[PDB]
C-alpha cells in the first residue's frame, strides 16, 4: 500500500496549510494518498473529501468525529494530521491514538489549552505537535511534549523587503505623504471601545501632520458598518480611507500602524511597518482571569479556605450535565451538606470582627 | 480644634461603610467633625457634604477632585479616608499625601490594582489600607504596604445561624420541598451565556426532584427582562420564582445555589447555603489576559524579541494622548523607525524556514 495520510481541516486557514503540506509531501512521494476532511484547496491537490471542511467551520460535528473515528480506525492510515481546529481534532487524535494510529497536531492550540490539564491532553493525544513559533516549542519542551518548531507559513509567503511604493500605488496613496494605518481589530468588543480612541488618536496626529493619510482595513461588511457608525459620532469630519480587507497592503504602505490585536502585529512585523499596540479589556474580566491564573480558584469561599471547599466548574466544564451532577449531592441536604454548613460557619467567624469598630480604631490611631 | 475627618464615598456601598465608621468614631469622640463627599446615610450621621456622593457614581469628577485637593489641603484634616472608589480616591489620596496629610484607603481595590505598578501607587498614596479579607492583607504584606485586616462588614450584618424557615415564609416557599437558587449574575455578559445553561441545569434536576422549587433573584428590571427573554426560548414551560432582588432571602431559604459570581459566593457562604460556582468567559479574552499575566507582553513581536521592542499601551494607558505620543516618533520615518525595521527583518528571518517542507518532513519521519 502506498503512503496513506489522513487529514482534517476545519477552516480556510487549515485548508491552506493542508494544501501546502500535500504538495510538499507529493514532492517526496508522488504516489501518496490523502483522505479526510478537506477544503477546496486540499481537494484540488488530490485529497479525498469524506467530509467537506465547511461542515466543521455540534450534534453534526459529534457524529462526523464518531464516523471518522470508525473509518480511520478501519483505514489505519500511516499518519493522521489534525490541522488546527483543536476543539475537534484533539479528541479525534486521542481516539485514533487509542487504536495505535500515529497522530500529529498542526499548529499550537494556544487559546484552546487554557490550563495545564489540556496540555497533558495534547501530549496524550499526539505523537508530535508542530509549532509556528519558537516560544511555543519552548513551552511544550517544559512539559516533555514532543514539538517541532517549523517556522511560520506567513513568513514564507511575505518577502523580507516589501515594496512600500507598490502597495501605495495599489491603494492610491501618494508617495510623499505620511500614512497611518488603523486596525481597530477583528472582533466586536475590540472595535467598539478602540475605534473611537483610534480615531481620536488620528485627529491628534493631524495637528502635527495636516496631510496625514489614514487607511482603515475593515475585515467584513458588519465590521465596516460598525466603524462607520462609530465614526459618524466621534469624528464625522475626519477624512480616512476605508478599505474592504487589504490589511497587508495598508501595513506595507504605511509609515506607522496603530493595532488593537497583538496577533495582527505579526503580519505588521512582516510588513516592516513600525507599530503601536493598544488594547483594552473589561477590568472585572481581567481581574477574574488573573485571580484564576494566580490561585487556580475563582470564588471567595475557596480563597478563604485554601482548597476546593466549593465546586467550581469553569469554561467547557460549565455545562448543564456537570452542574446538575455537582448540585445533586447538595440538594440531598444530608451529611455532605451539613459538613459544608459547618465549614461555612467557621469561615464566617474568621471574618466577623466588628469592622466598623476596627476602622474607627485605625483612624484614631493614625490621628494620635 | 476637635478631631476633623475627611471622607469621600462614591457609591451607596461606600455611603454605608462611611455611616458605620462615623457612628463608631462618635462613640470615642462625640465632638468629631466629618466633611467631604457624603451620601444620605453619611449626612444623616452628621457629615458635612461639600459634594454629594451621587456626583461621583469625568470632566466634573476631575474638577471636584481638584477642588477637594485644594480645600482639604487648606483644611488640613487629621485624617482623610478614601472609601473605595479607587479610580477617584487613590489619586486624591496621593495629592493629599504630597501635602503631609495622613491618608487611609478603605477596601482593597482588587480590580483597580491590575498590575504591580498600581500596587506601588497605593503604597505611595496611603499611610494604611483597610482590607476586609485576610488574603488581601497577606498580599499587601508581600509588598511592605501597611494593611490592617478588619474583617468583612457583611459578616457583622449576617447571623452565624440564619433562619431558613423564616426566609421561606417571606418568599412563600414550602418547608418540605427542595429549593434551588439560580443566580446567573449581575452583569450582562454573565446573564446571556449562563442563564440558558442554569435553566437547563434546573430542568435536569427536576427529573430527580419533580417538585423542586426554583428561585431566581434578579437585581433590576433590565436584568429581569433579559432573563425572561432567555427563558421564553430555552425553557418556557419551566415554573420558577422570579424575584425582584431578595438574593439573600433566596440563598438562606434554598438547599443549594448555582452561582455565576465568585463574589456573590461570599453572601451565599454567610447564608450557609451550599453552592456550586459555574462561570464562563471568552476563551480568546482569557488567553490574552493569561498571556499578559505570564509574560508581561501581549504582542507577538515582543514575545519573539524578548523585550518591549514594540510599545504596548494597555488598559488606562490605551488613551489617545499616549497613543499619539507613541506614534509620532514612528511617523517621522527616521532613525528609530529604521532600527525597528532592521529588527523586524532579523525576526522575520528567524521564523522563515519553509514550514510546508518542515511539516512534510515530520510526517515522513513519523511514517517511517
Ligand atoms: Li477578627
Ligand atoms: Li528556520
Ligand atoms: Na496627503
Ligand atoms: Na473547572
Ligand atoms: Na413544591
Ligand atoms: Na501598558
Residue numbers in the entry:
A (entry chain A), B (entry chain A): 5 to 61, 72 to 382
List sentences quoted exactly from the publication behind this structure:
LpxB is a glycosyltransferase in the Raetz (lipid A synthesis) pathway that catalyzes nucleophilic attack of the 6′-hydroxyl of lipid X (1) on the anomeric carbon of UDP-diacyl-glucosamine (UDP-DAG) (2) to form β(1–6)-tetraacyl-disaccharide 1-phosphate (lipid A disaccharide) (3). Here we present the first crystal structures of a soluble variant of E. coli LpxB in the apo form and bound to UDP, which reveals a novel glycosyltransferase-B (GT-B) dimer wherein the C-terminal tail of one subunit completes the fold of the other subunit. The structure reveals that LpxB has a glycosyltransferase-B family fold but with a highly intertwined, C-terminally swapped dimer comprising four domains.
LpxB6S was crystallized with one molecule in the asymmetric unit. However, the biological assembly is a highly intertwined, C-terminally swapped homodimer. Each half of the LpxB dimer consists of two Rossmann-like domains with a parallel β-sheet core sandwiched between α-helices. The first Rossmann-like domain is composed of the N-terminal half of one subunit (residues 1–166) and the last helix (369–382) from the C-terminus of the other subunit. This domain is connected via short antiparallel helical linkers to the second domain, which is composed of residues 177–295 of the first subunit and 296–345 of the second subunit. The reciprocally swapped C-terminal segments wrap around the opposing subunit in an interlocked arrangement. These extensive interactions bury a total surface area of 12,650 Å2, forming an LpxB dimer with an overall ‘bowtie’-shape. LpxB in our crystal structure appears to be in an open conformation.
